[PDB]
Structures are given as structure tokens and as C-alpha cells.
Design a protein around this motif. Structure first.
Motif, mmCIF file in Angstrom:
data_model
loop_
_atom_site.group_PDB
_atom_site.id
_atom_site.type_symbol
_atom_site.label_atom_id
_atom_site.label_comp_id
_atom_site.label_asym_id
_atom_site.label_seq_id
_atom_site.Cartn_x
_atom_site.Cartn_y
_atom_site.Cartn_z
ATOM 1 N N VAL A 63 -100.181 -40.970 101.584
ATOM 2 C CA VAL A 63 -101.456 -40.713 101.827
ATOM 3 C C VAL A 63 -101.533 -41.125 103.410
ATOM 4 O O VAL A 63 -101.246 -42.180 103.798
ATOM 5 C CB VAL A 63 -102.430 -41.377 101.028
ATOM 6 C CG1 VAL A 63 -103.860 -41.155 101.377
ATOM 7 C CG2 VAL A 63 -102.260 -40.583 99.591
ATOM 8 N N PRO A 64 -102.213 -39.908 104.199
ATOM 9 C CA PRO A 64 -102.341 -40.296 105.549
ATOM 10 C C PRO A 64 -103.339 -41.123 105.839
ATOM 11 O O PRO A 64 -104.487 -41.532 105.182
ATOM 12 C CB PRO A 64 -102.823 -38.701 106.237
ATOM 13 C CG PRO A 64 -102.667 -37.777 105.109
ATOM 14 C CD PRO A 64 -102.526 -38.613 103.628
ATOM 15 N N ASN A 69 -107.411 -38.178 106.443
ATOM 16 C CA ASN A 69 -107.791 -38.697 105.138
ATOM 17 C C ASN A 69 -109.599 -38.381 104.937
ATOM 18 O O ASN A 69 -110.231 -38.502 106.025
ATOM 19 C CB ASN A 69 -107.763 -40.196 105.193
ATOM 20 C CG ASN A 69 -107.830 -40.795 103.937
ATOM 21 O OD1 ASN A 69 -108.897 -40.855 103.320
ATOM 22 N ND2 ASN A 69 -106.738 -41.510 103.411
ATOM 23 N N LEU A 70 -109.883 -37.950 103.778
ATOM 24 C CA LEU A 70 -110.984 -37.560 103.690
ATOM 25 C C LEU A 70 -111.938 -38.791 103.746
ATOM 26 O O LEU A 70 -113.189 -38.676 104.166
ATOM 27 C CB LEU A 70 -111.248 -36.973 102.155
ATOM 28 C CG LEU A 70 -112.353 -35.969 101.943
ATOM 29 C CD1 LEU A 70 -112.535 -34.893 102.877
ATOM 30 C CD2 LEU A 70 -112.514 -35.604 100.413
ATOM 31 N N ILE A 92 -107.895 -48.714 100.396
ATOM 32 C CA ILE A 92 -108.152 -47.778 99.045
ATOM 33 C C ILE A 92 -107.045 -48.290 98.234
ATOM 34 O O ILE A 92 -105.884 -48.096 98.579
ATOM 35 C CB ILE A 92 -107.913 -46.217 99.692
ATOM 36 C CG1 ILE A 92 -108.658 -45.963 100.618
ATOM 37 C CG2 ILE A 92 -108.009 -45.558 97.942
ATOM 38 C CD1 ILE A 92 -108.580 -44.474 101.332
ATOM 39 N N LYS A 94 -105.425 -47.186 95.013
ATOM 40 C CA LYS A 94 -105.604 -45.823 94.138
ATOM 41 C C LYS A 94 -104.823 -45.906 93.005
ATOM 42 O O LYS A 94 -103.580 -46.087 92.558
ATOM 43 C CB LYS A 94 -104.840 -44.695 94.953
ATOM 44 C CG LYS A 94 -105.926 -44.263 96.504
ATOM 45 C CD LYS A 94 -104.964 -43.020 97.062
ATOM 46 C CE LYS A 94 -105.045 -41.755 96.314
ATOM 47 N NZ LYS A 94 -106.600 -41.279 96.203
ATOM 48 N N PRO A 97 -104.144 -39.765 90.986
ATOM 49 C CA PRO A 97 -102.771 -39.255 91.399
ATOM 50 C C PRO A 97 -103.287 -38.619 92.722
ATOM 51 O O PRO A 97 -103.980 -37.750 92.677
ATOM 52 C CB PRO A 97 -102.432 -38.307 90.319
ATOM 53 C CG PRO A 97 -103.505 -38.227 89.525
ATOM 54 C CD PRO A 97 -104.551 -39.226 89.632
ATOM 55 N N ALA A 99 -102.909 -35.302 95.002
ATOM 56 C CA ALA A 99 -102.739 -33.815 94.897
ATOM 57 C C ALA A 99 -102.851 -33.423 93.351
ATOM 58 O O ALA A 99 -101.862 -32.518 93.133
ATOM 59 C CB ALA A 99 -101.676 -33.401 95.829
ATOM 60 N N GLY A 100 -103.294 -34.242 92.514
ATOM 61 C CA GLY A 100 -103.263 -34.000 91.135
ATOM 62 C C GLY A 100 -104.169 -33.338 90.205
ATOM 63 O O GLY A 100 -104.163 -33.397 89.064
ATOM 64 N N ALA A 103 -109.342 -35.091 91.795
ATOM 65 C CA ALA A 103 -110.232 -35.540 93.123
ATOM 66 C C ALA A 103 -110.071 -36.632 93.497
ATOM 67 O O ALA A 103 -111.144 -37.328 93.809
ATOM 68 C CB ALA A 103 -111.569 -34.904 92.567
ATOM 69 N N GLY A 104 -109.029 -37.381 93.634
ATOM 70 C CA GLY A 104 -108.832 -38.911 94.314
ATOM 71 C C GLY A 104 -109.415 -38.875 95.707
ATOM 72 O O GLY A 104 -109.857 -39.698 95.778
ATOM 73 N N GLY A 105 -108.761 -38.055 96.627
ATOM 74 C CA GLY A 105 -109.521 -37.982 97.808
ATOM 75 C C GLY A 105 -110.913 -37.891 98.052
ATOM 76 O O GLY A 105 -111.767 -38.699 98.755
ATOM 77 N N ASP A 139 -115.624 -31.387 95.699
ATOM 78 C CA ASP A 139 -115.698 -32.423 94.497
ATOM 79 C C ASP A 139 -116.233 -33.886 94.933
ATOM 80 O O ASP A 139 -116.340 -34.597 94.010
ATOM 81 C CB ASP A 139 -114.196 -32.557 94.123
ATOM 82 C CG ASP A 139 -113.669 -31.217 93.324
ATOM 83 O OD1 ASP A 139 -114.248 -30.701 92.844
ATOM 84 O OD2 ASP A 139 -112.154 -31.043 93.035
ATOM 85 N N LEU A 178 -99.915 -30.243 93.822
ATOM 86 C CA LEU A 178 -100.392 -28.988 94.047
ATOM 87 C C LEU A 178 -101.495 -29.019 95.168
ATOM 88 O O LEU A 178 -102.333 -29.734 94.908
ATOM 89 C CB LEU A 178 -100.722 -28.065 92.941
ATOM 90 C CG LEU A 178 -99.774 -27.614 91.741
ATOM 91 C CD1 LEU A 178 -100.013 -27.078 90.669
ATOM 92 C CD2 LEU A 178 -98.882 -26.393 92.731
ATOM 93 N N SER A 256 -106.796 -28.238 89.599
ATOM 94 C CA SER A 256 -106.038 -27.227 90.203
ATOM 95 C C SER A 256 -104.715 -27.951 89.694
ATOM 96 O O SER A 256 -103.515 -27.244 90.109
ATOM 97 C CB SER A 256 -106.060 -27.118 91.611
ATOM 98 O OG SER A 256 -106.349 -28.406 92.195
HETATM 99 N N1 LIG Z 1 -107.947 -40.552 100.370
HETATM 100 C C1 LIG Z 1 -106.911 -39.619 100.075
HETATM 101 N N2 LIG Z 1 -106.147 -39.526 98.960
HETATM 102 C C2 LIG Z 1 -105.262 -38.796 98.456
HETATM 103 N N3 LIG Z 1 -104.975 -37.623 99.388
HETATM 104 C C3 LIG Z 1 -105.612 -37.516 100.442
HETATM 105 C C4 LIG Z 1 -106.727 -38.436 101.039
HETATM 106 N N4 LIG Z 1 -107.209 -37.812 102.054
HETATM 107 C C5 LIG Z 1 -106.437 -36.738 102.430
HETATM 108 N N5 LIG Z 1 -105.599 -36.408 101.500
HETATM 109 C C6 LIG Z 1 -104.785 -35.245 101.479
HETATM 110 O O1 LIG Z 1 -105.516 -34.428 100.430
HETATM 111 C C7 LIG Z 1 -104.533 -33.692 99.625
HETATM 112 C C8 LIG Z 1 -104.653 -34.309 98.316
HETATM 113 O O2 LIG Z 1 -105.941 -34.647 97.818
HETATM 114 P P1 LIG Z 1 -106.465 -35.250 96.455
HETATM 115 O O3 LIG Z 1 -105.608 -36.203 95.947
HETATM 116 O O4 LIG Z 1 -107.992 -35.362 96.562
HETATM 117 O O5 LIG Z 1 -106.167 -33.902 95.570
HETATM 118 P P2 LIG Z 1 -106.815 -33.517 94.186
HETATM 119 O O6 LIG Z 1 -107.065 -34.553 93.516
HETATM 120 O O7 LIG Z 1 -105.952 -32.277 93.667
HETATM 121 O O8 LIG Z 1 -108.112 -32.740 94.866
HETATM 122 P P3 LIG Z 1 -109.127 -31.514 93.964
HETATM 123 O O9 LIG Z 1 -108.787 -31.797 92.638
HETATM 124 O O10 LIG Z 1 -110.391 -32.174 94.490
HETATM 125 O O11 LIG Z 1 -108.966 -30.088 94.642
HETATM 126 C C9 LIG Z 1 -103.118 -34.003 100.267
HETATM 127 O O12 LIG Z 1 -103.111 -32.942 101.348
HETATM 128 C C10 LIG Z 1 -103.518 -35.357 100.943
HETATM 129 O O13 LIG Z 1 -102.480 -35.626 102.135
#
Ligand SMILES: Nc1ncnc2c1ncn2[C@@H]1O[C@H](COP(=O)(O)OP(=O)(O)OP(=O)(O)O)[C@@H](O)[C@H]1O
Length: 299
Positions: A63-64, A69-70, A92, A94, A97, A99-100, A103-105, A139, A178, A256
């Protein structure tokens, strides 16, 4: 067990699963029922000389910690709103997961909004935090809101719904992730191509939630992005089938993807389901959780 040093504000923000997700046209128009679950991130914010981000837990390596980073984007937006520099450190821890599809970001970003408001005692009301969340991402508003909610527009407009029980979940994390834009591109591709079925209206599902009835809810769960996530990651079919045969009432891709969620009748069934998935060699790692839980809140 949360990091709660003197001067610091620590905020817990939940991951989500979409109980219902209808996807319209060309952002995409969405109708979704978000449900917040006990797999969460905990974010500790402190005053510091400069803006910084550190991460442990899921995505510790990857995670950047910069402008990508959001949570970075959240701190900048909130600082600007109240006329201050974003001079905070953000830590953070965490469990959601990367990109899972949970909506963890977004959880992290919502937690930063709440943490800074408290840290600085800025008096920013919930409605204003909502607006900031909506600027950050689709999200983020739900991560502030929590509970169970009907999201419309592109998901940012929220009407709370009743989920009149504790609902028991197993989550199966995938080996990789994804990109949500890729999955939206894929559903558009699938629809160029065929005329597969759309979900029914959310009425019945909402009624089952209001009755607090997991057995009624289960067959009504549905996610139009699932076909796109499974098209991209066909191995998810094995994960879903495995969770279902282990005793889940239903399995669905979360948002997603590629996380799979499994609704169970009871704590004990979630015990059985998680244990069998862990043993079945079809996913990376397994979690038990419950919902609904609160939105981003100070601990
Ligand atoms: N705080 C963070 N946590 C995780 N990934 C992050 C964060 N900030 C930026 N990213 C980037 O965002 C993407 C992953 O986001 P996240 O883990 O929220 O995806 P997600 O849970 O599938 O999101 P959603 O379900 O909201 O579309 C990656 O490209 C990752 O490098």
C-alpha cells in the motif's frame, strides 16, 4: 489493542459487503445495499511536522504511503476545508483486504476525516464530512455512515435501512486483487456482448433485512459486478462453490471482488464454513465477521 497514544486520535472504520448491487449505464449509475462488517481498519492520527502515512497489516508491503493513498487525499481535503496545513501523521492498521472489493482505502479515508475533526476539534458536522467523503470516492460516504444503507446515484447518496439482526459472515480473501475500474470496464464488455439477467428490484431483499431473517435474505443477495469479477478471475467459482458446500446459506463476490462473502445462519455455521474454506485450498486466507457495525468512529 488499538494504538491510542496521548494526543492521538484513533478511529475504527469498517469494511463493506454489497448485499445488493445493480449497475446501470455509462461513474456508473448504481443501486446498492451496503452492509458494514467487523473486518475493519484502525487509523491513528497525530499532529506532526509533516503529512505522513505508515501501514501495517493487510498490504503492509505494498500500500503506497504517498499521494496515491486515499488517506493522503483525505488529510489534504480536510485540512483545506478548515484552513490549516495537513501536518499529521497517519498510521493504518489494516484488516480490510487490499483491492478486494470491501472498500478498505475508503475506510481509511473516512477514518482520517473523523480522526482529524476530533484531533483539531474542528467542529465539522456530519453532513459536511459526508460531502468531503463524496469528493474523495464513491465508497467513502458509506465508510463514514456504516450500518446498512441504500446507496444510489453512484453510491454516494445514502438512505439507511433496517437490518434487524446480527448477520454472520465468512470472507475468503483471494491471492491477488482487482482494480475496480477494470471490473466496471468488464461488465460493460459483457453487456456489449450478451443480454444476461439483471437483478430484481431491491424490495424483497430489503424486506428480509427488516425482518432480520438471514435464511430469507440469502437467496436474494446479488451483485451484478460478480459476473465481471468471475470473468476476470474464474477461480472464484471454486471459492464460491466451496463455501456453499461447507454450509453457507449463500456466497457472493463482494463489490468488484475478488473477495468472496458467505452469509451463514449462525456463529457456529460461520465457524464450520471458515474452517472448511481454510482447509479446501481455494483461497488465500479466511475471516469471520459480523454485521452490521458502526461507521467510522473514535475509539
Ligand atoms: N489506504 C489504502 N488502502 C489500500 N489501498 C489503497 C489505499 N490508498 C490507495 N490505495 C490504492 O487503491 C487501490 C486499492 O483500494 P482498496 O483496497 O480500497 O480497493 P477496494 O477495496 O477493491 O475498493 P472498492 O471496493 O471501494 O472499489 C490500489 O490501487 C491501492 O494501491
Amino acid at each position: 489493542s488499538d494504538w491510542v497514544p496521548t494526543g492521538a486520535v484513533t478511529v475504527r472504520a469498517p469494511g463493506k459487503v454489497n448485499l445488493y448491487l445493480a449497475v446501470g449505464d455509462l461513474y456508473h449509475e448504481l443501486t446498492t445495499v451496503f452492509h458494514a462488517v467487523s473486518l475493519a481498519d484502525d487509523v491513528t492520527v497525530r499532529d506532526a511536522d509533516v503529512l505522513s502515512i505508515d501501514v501495517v497489516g493487510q498490504g503492509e508491503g505494498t500500500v503506497p504511503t504517498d499521494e496515491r493513498n486515499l488517506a493522503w487525499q483525505a488529510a489534504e481535503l480536510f485540512a483545506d476545508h478548515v484552513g490549516r496545513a495537513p501536518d499529521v501523521s497517519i498510521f493504518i492498521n489494516k484488516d480490510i483486504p487490499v483491492a478486494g472489493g470491501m472498500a478498505g482505502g475508503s475506510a481509511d479515508a473516512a477514518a482520517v476525516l473523523v480522526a482529524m475533526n476530533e484531533l483539531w476539534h474542528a467542529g465539522v458536522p456530519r453532513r459536511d464530512l459526508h460531502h468531503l467523503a463524496a469528493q474523495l470516492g464513491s465508497d467513502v460516504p458509506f465508510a463514514l455512515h456504516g450500518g446498512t444503507a441504500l446507496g444510489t446515484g453512484r453510491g454516494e447518496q445514502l438512505a439507511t435501512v433496517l437490518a434487524r439482526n446480527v448477520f454472520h459472515w465468512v470472507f475468503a480473501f483471494a491471492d491477488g486483487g482487482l482494480a475496480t475500474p477494470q471490473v466496471f470496464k468488464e461488465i460493460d464488455r459483457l453487456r456489449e456482448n450478451g443480454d444476461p439477467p439483471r437483478l430484481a428490484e431491491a424490495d424483497e431483499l430489503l424486506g428480509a433485512l427488516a425482518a432480520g431473517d438471514a435464511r430469507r435474505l440469502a437467496p436474494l443477495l446479488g451483485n451484478e459486478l460478480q459476473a465481471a469479477a468471475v470473468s476476470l478471475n474464474p477461480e472464484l467459482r471454486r471459492t464460491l462453490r466451496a463455501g456453499e458446500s461447507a454450509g453457507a446459506l449463500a456466497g457472493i463476490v463482494s463489490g468488484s471482488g475478488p473477495t468472496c462473502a458467505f452469509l451463514c445462519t449462525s456463529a457456529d455455521d460461520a465457524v464450520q464454513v471458515s474452517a472448511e474454506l481454510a482447509g479446501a485450498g481455494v483461497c488465500r486466507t479466511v475471516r469471520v465477521a459480523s454485521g452490521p457495525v458502526h461507521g467510522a468512529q473514535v475509539i
